[PDB]
Amino acid sequence: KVFGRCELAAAMKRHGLDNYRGYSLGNWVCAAKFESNFNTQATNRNTDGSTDYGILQINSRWWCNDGRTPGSRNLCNIPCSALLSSDITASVNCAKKIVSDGNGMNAWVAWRNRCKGTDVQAWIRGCRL
Ligand SMILES: [O-][Cl+3]([O-])([O-])[O-]
Ligand SMILES: [O-][Cl+3]([O-])([O-])[O-]
Ligand SMILES: [O-][Cl+3]([O-])([O-])[O-]
Ligand SMILES: [O-][Cl+3]([O-])([O-])[O-]
Ligand SMILES: [O-][Cl+3]([O-])([O-])[O-]
Ligand SMILES: [Cl-]
Ligand code: NI
């Protein structure tokens, strides 16, 4: 599914990401914009041969199993394909683990490079949250 900006913000909130580990909703929307363009079916092969999956481009090296990423852990305990569903529950649950891992949202290099420090609230403006 390709989510609308406000639609994804509502979903992410319903799933308890607003201010999760201190990161307001707009940081989540922003990272998903730049990670998947809001597309639950986004897959991207990384240089190490792992793949990123979903709305928040969770990577098979540490977080989910895709069966083709040597050395990988499946820390969120799920098939990576479960991160491409139209229902973001599994992606959100897994994101909560990733952002809790130590580096907060810097885990998403696109968040660090394109969202961090910016007016992320712009990402949920006009939304009936
Ligand atoms: O639809 Cl945006 O790419 O302006 O969230
Ligand atoms: O990817 Cl780790 O669990 O070392 O942070
Ligand atoms: O859209 Cl930024 O990549 O300026 O947050
Ligand atoms: O993450 Cl915010 O509610 O500043 O957009
Ligand atoms: O906390 Cl609200 O459902 O009243 O906007
Ligand atoms: Cl392996
Ligand atoms: Ni409200």
UniProtKB/Swiss-Prot annotation:
Domain C-type lysozyme: residue ranges: 1-129
GO molecular function, one term: beta-N-acetylglucosaminidase activity
EC number(s) given by UniProt: 3.2.1.17
One Gene Ontology cellular component annotation held by this UniProt entry: cytoplasm
Source organism superkingdom: Eukaryota
GO annotation, biological process: cell wall macromolecule catabolic process; defense response to bacterium; defense response to Gram-negative bacterium; defense response to Gram-positive bacterium; killing of cells of another organism
Disulfide bonds: 6-127, 30-115, 64-80, 76-94
Compartments, as annotated in UniProt: Secreted
Keywords: Allergen, Antimicrobial, Bacteriolytic enzyme, Disulfide bond, Glycosidase, Hydrolase, Secreted, Signal
Active-site feature positions: 35, 52
InterPro entries reported in the protein's UniProt record: Glyco_hydro_22, Glyco_hydro_22_CS, Glyco_hydro_22_lys, Lysozyme-like_dom_sf
Positions bound to substrate: 101
Protein task: Lysozymes have primarily a bacteriolytic function; those in tissues and body fluids are associated with the monocyte-macrophage system and enhance the activity of immunoagents. Has bacteriolytic activity against M.luteus.
Additional comment: Lysozyme C is capable of both hydrolysis and transglycosylation; it also shows a slight esterase activity. It acts rapidly on both peptide-substituted and unsubstituted peptidoglycan, and slowly on chitin oligosaccharides.
Recorded family membership: Belongs to the glycosyl hydrolase 22 family.
Subunit structure: Monomer.
Protein name: Lysozyme C
Organism name: Gallus gallus
Gene: LYZ
